[PDB]
């Protein structure tokens, strides 16, 4: 898994 979820959207 990743820790930089700030840079990504689900869809």
């Amino acid at each position, epitope marked *: 898994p990743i*820790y*930089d979820i*700030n840079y990504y959207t689900s869809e």
Partner: antibody, heavy 114, light 110 residues
Framework: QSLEESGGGLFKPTDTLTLTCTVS????????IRWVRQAPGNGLEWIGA???????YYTSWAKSRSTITRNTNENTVTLKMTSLTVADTATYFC?????????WGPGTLVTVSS | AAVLTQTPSPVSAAVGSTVTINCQSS????????LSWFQQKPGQPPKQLIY???TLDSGVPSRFSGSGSGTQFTLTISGVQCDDAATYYC?????????FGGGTEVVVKG
């Protein structure tokens, strides 16, 4: 979980800076890596970052003369910044992103001087 | 282009008093709580004191407290000590960037 900057030292105006951030004890595929600099006696400034998927982000002044890349097999992240001026004189840090932003490298001093 | 603005520097504080450093973000930080506080002493690298707006980092003294959410954040230093003389920075993360406040220098009168 640690980071180490290398590539600092003395540069002339117009030269290219190439800093390497070498990481240990965590995977680049799970974290962002951010680049921050601090001019002598001044504030911290975010330059840019690369995400867990290898895409980079940059501040307005950096975007047009900076490239941030990585090598996941060699555990490195690279900052390349062209057209150095004396105002680029600073300590440059890499640091591991995520909500817990506590793990930084020790910093490497970049001096731009004739 | 989110910008962080903090308490103007310098803050002069008598030992044992309570210091407050305020930090305002021009846009909400990611998920409202991606906001760290950093301490830096001249000639040393910055140290994270607080992450997630209000979580104390390991080994950081109980004197420090972070609060706030969204765009408005506060660091307080309860019973400020000589060891707390330093410059403090708020640090926000957003959808496509991170940023630091300008820093607030705390000068402790002993």
């Amino acid at each position: 979980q640690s980071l180490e900057e290398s590539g600092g030292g003395l540069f002339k105006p117009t030269d290219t800076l190439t800093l390497t951030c070498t990481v240990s004890g965590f995977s680049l595929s799970s974290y962002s890596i951010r680049w921050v600099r601090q001019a002598p006696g001044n504030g911290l400034e975010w330059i840019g970052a690369i995400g867990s998927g290898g895409n980079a982000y940059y501040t307005s002044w950096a975007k047009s003369r900076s490239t941030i890349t990585r090598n996941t097999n060699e555990n490195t992240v690279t900052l390349k910044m062209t057209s150095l001026t004396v105002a680029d004189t600073a300590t440059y840090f890499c640091a591991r992103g995520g909500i817990n932003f506590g793990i930084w490298g020790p910093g490497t001093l970049v001096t731009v001087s004739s | 282009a989110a910008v962080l603005t903090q308490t103007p520097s310098p803050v002069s504080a008598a030992v044992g008093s309570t210091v407050t450093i305020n930090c305002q973000s021009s846009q909400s930080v990611y998920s409202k709580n991606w906001l760290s506080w950093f301490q830096q002493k001249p000639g040393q690298p910055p140290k994270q004191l607080i992450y997630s707006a209000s979580t104390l980092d390991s080994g950081v003294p109980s004197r420090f407290s972070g609060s706030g959410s969204g765009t408005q954040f506060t660091l307080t230093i309860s019973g400020v000590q000589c060891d707390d003389a330093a410059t403090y920075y708020c640090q926000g993360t957003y959808g496509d960037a991170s940023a630091f406040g300008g820093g607030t220098e705390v000068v402790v009168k002993g």
